[PDB]
Amino acid sequence: QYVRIKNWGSGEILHDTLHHKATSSIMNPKSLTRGPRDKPTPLEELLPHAIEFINQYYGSFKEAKIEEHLARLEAVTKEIETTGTYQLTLDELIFATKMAHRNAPRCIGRIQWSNLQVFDARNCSTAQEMFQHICRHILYATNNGNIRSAITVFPQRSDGKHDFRLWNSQLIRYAGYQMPDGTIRGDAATLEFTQLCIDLGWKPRYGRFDVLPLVLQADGQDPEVFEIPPDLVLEVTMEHPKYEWFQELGLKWYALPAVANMLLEVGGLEFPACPFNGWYMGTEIGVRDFCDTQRYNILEEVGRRMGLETHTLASLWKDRAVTEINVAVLHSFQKQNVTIMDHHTASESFMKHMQNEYRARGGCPADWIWLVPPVSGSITPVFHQEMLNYVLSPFYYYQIEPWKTHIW
Amino acid sequence: QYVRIKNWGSGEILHDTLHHKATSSIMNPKSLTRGPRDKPTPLEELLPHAIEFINQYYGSFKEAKIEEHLARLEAVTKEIETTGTYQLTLDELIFATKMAHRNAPRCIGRIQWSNLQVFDARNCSTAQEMFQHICRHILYATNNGNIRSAITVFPQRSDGKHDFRLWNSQLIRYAGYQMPDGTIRGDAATLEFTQLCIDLGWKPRYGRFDVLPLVLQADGQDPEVFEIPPDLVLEVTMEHPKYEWFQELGLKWYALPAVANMLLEVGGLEFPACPFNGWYMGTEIGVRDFCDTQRYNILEEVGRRMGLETHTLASLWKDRAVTEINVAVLHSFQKQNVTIMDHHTASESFMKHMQNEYRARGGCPADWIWLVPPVSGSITPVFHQEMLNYVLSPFYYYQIEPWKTHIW
C-alpha cells in the first residue's frame, strides 16, 4: 500500500500515495536492518556464506597460504556439519571487524579502517561480565582524551532466543526528561529510552548532562541496569575563545562517540552486540547535538548573545551562530587534549580514502546523504562527488529496538 | 559491466566494480533524461498516454465537465487517428506547464507552482522567431528586477528530425575561456560551450562577466547565433554592507535564473525547447557560482581580506567567508530591488508546500540531495525530512547535449 515517511525534527509522519502513479533518504530502511529470529540459521544458507567469507579472508593476504585456506574450508564445513554453526578464529574476527567498518557506506572516518582494536568477549555469559567488558572498552578507547578506535565483540547469535545486546543507542549518552514546564531537559533524543531506564529502577538525577546507565541483556535474559563509573566518562566543557559569555552557557559533551546497538554480520554469522567507537567530528556535537530542534536546541540562545536579528530569518543569523558554536567545540577539544577532527579536514580525508579504495578494490560503498556534513555542504569535496551506496559483507546492520521484541 | 562515476569538482571520473559483489546521487541519471529520436512516437503508445493526460486535466477541476471531457477524448483520438499526434489546447498547455513544475523533485520553489506565465510559441518556425520570443520572455520575467515566473513553449517534437531547441544551459549566462596564464577567466562551467559559440563566429570579449549568445536551433536546422541585447540582461553588483573592500572584488551576477535546455513531456508529447524561470535563492550565487572550485572560486580571496587563517583548514575560515559572501549577495539584491529569497526562508516555504501537497494529493516527488542547500544543511527543516523521489507526468526531463547528436 502506501509508504510511511518521517520528519525527524517534528516527529511528524506522513503516508505517500502519489508514488503509486509513478512511471517505469530514509533513515532506517529495512534494507539496512537485520532483525531478530526464533531459530538457528539453516545450514544450506549458512555454509555457502561461511565458504564465501573464508575465501575472502584468505584471498586478502599478499602471498597466499593455499594449504591453510583449503584446511580452514574443511574444518569449517566439519564444524557446521557437526555443531550447527562455526566459530571464527581471532585472526578472522579482527578482519571481520575491519572489513565491515571498511564497508559502512554511512561513515566518513573509514580512512582509518585498518587501525581498530578488537576485544574478543565471545566467552561472555553473564550481564555483569558484559558490563565489565564495556567498562574496559570505554577506558581503553578514552585513553585520557587521546581517543583510540576500538570494538568489543560479544557471543554470536545462535538460536535467536539467547541474544546478547545493549539497549543503549550509544555507550555514553545523556538523559532527557519531560519536565512540567511544557519543556524538556537534557537530551530530547533519549526521551523515550530514559523512561525505560526509569521503568527498570534507575534513579533520575534530573539534569541536562546526566550520563545514562548501560542496560545490558545477556544470553537472551532480561536486561539488568548498570551505572557508569563517572571516573570513566571523560567530558569536554564548552568555552568559546572570544565570547567569554559562552561558558555562561554551561555546555559540555562526552568525548567518546561509541555506538552501542548495531549488529555485525560476517560469513553468515551475526553478532547483535558489538559496540564500537572512533572519535568525534566536530559538527556532530556543534551542529546536530547542539543545534537540532530535536536535541539541545541552543541556536536561539547563542544568537541572542551575539546581538543578532533573531526574529528576521533572512538576517542569516543562524549561519553566524552555528559557525561560532563549532569554533567553540573544536577549540574546547584541542584545549583539553581531546582527539577531534573538523568536518572540512574530515571531508578531504574521506576523499583520499575513496580514491585509495577505487585503486585498491574498485569501489567504495558510500551514502552521500550521510557523508555530507550538516553545514558547509557545497564547501566540502564530498558534495561534488557522485557515489554509489551498496551493502556488502561483512557489514554493520541496524536492529529493531530491543524492547519492541524482547519477552520479559 | 562497471559504472561511470563523476566528481564534478575535479572532473575526475571513476569506474565502480565493487558494487557487483553487492547483496540482494548521480547528477544526470538516464532515468532523468529524455533523448532524441528519428521517428514519430508510435500511435499505440501515444494514444494511451494522451488519454491519461486528458483524464487528468479534466479530473482536476472542482466541478467536473463530463461532456467536454468525453468530447475532448473523442476529438483527441480522431486527431491522432488522423494526423499522427495531437495539439494541446492552450488551457491544457498551461496546466501541463504547472503540473510539470509541480512534479519536479529537484525544485525548492514549488510552493509557487500555480503562478506561472505561459508564452505559447508553438507557431514558431524560424530561428529569428525563436530569438524574438526569447527576448520577450527575458523582458517579462525580469520586470526591472521584480522577477516574474514565466515559461516559453516552442513547437512540439514531431519526427525527431525537426527539433526546436536552445543549445544554452540557461538563457543568460557568463562565458569562460582558457587564458594563457594556466588560469581561466569568467565562468569555468561554460568553458566547453563558450568554445562552441566561438566555433560559430561569436566574438570573444575575454572578460569575467560576458553574457554568452543564444544559440538557437529551429525545425531541426543548424543553430544560428544571436547576441543578447544588453538592455535586457539586468545584473546585480556585489557589495557587502560592512566590508567596503568587498566591491573592490568587482563582483556581479545576472538577476534571471532561466533554465534553457530541458524538455517537457506531457500526454505522450515532448517539447525539447521550453525555457523557464523562477527567481534566485541566494546560495545559488553566493555558494555555488561564487565558491565552487569548478566555478568562480572566490573563497580564498574573500578569506584573505578577512585576515583569516587561510592555510589552516581547521580554522573554520571557510565557514566564516561563505557566510559573508551570502550576506553580500542577499544584501545586494534587496538594495537594488531584485527579487530574491534566502535558503532558510526557502526551506521553511518548501516545507509548507510539502505539507500542502500531502493533504492535497498524498505525496510530493522530492530529491533530498537537491532540496537541501549547499550550506546550513542540518539547520534547515528539509534536512530532517525523509522524502521519496519519483518521476511523474507531466515532467521536465534533461536531454543529451545538442552538439553530441545534431547533424550539420
Ligand code: HEM
Ligand atoms: C576516525 C574514526 C571515525 C570517524 C572520524 C567516524 C565518523 C563518523 C561519523 C561523523 C558518523 C555519522 C554520525 C551520525 O550521524 O550518527 C559515523 C557513522 C558510522 N560509522 Fe564512523 N567514525 C569513525 C570510526 C568508525 C568505526 C571504528 C566504525 C566501526 C568499526 C565506524 C562505523 C560507522 C557506522 C556503522 C556508522 C553508521 C551509524 C549510524 O548509522 O547511525 N566508524 N562515523
Ligand code: HEM
Ligand atoms: C519561486 C520560484 C523558484 C524558485 C525559488 C526555484 C528554485 C530552484 C533552485 C534553487 C533550484 C536548484 C538550482 C540548481 O542547483 O541548478 C531549482 C531547480 C529546478 N527547478 Fe525551480 N525555482 C523556481 C521556479 C521554478 C519554475 C517556474 C520551474 C518550472 C516551471 C522550476 C523547475 C525546476 C527544475 C526542473 C529544476 C532542476 C534543474 C536542474 O535539474 O538542473 N522551478 N529551482
Ligand SMILES: C[C@H](O)[C@H](O)[C@H]1CNc2nc(N)[nH]c(=O)c2N1
Ligand atoms: C531525513 C534524513 O535522511 C536525515 O535527517 C539524515 C540526513 N543525513 C544524515 N547524515 C548523518 N551523518 N547523520 C544523520 O543523522 C543524517 N540524517
Ligand SMILES: C[C@H](O)[C@H](O)[C@H]1CNc2nc(N)[nH]c(=O)c2N1
Ligand atoms: C555529486 C552530487 O550529486 C552533486 O554535486 C549535486 C549535490 N546536490 C545538488 N543540489 C542542487 N540544488 N544543485 C546541485 O548542482 C547539486 N549537486
Ligand SMILES: [N+]
Ligand atoms: N562517531
Ligand SMILES: [N+]
Ligand atoms: N533557479
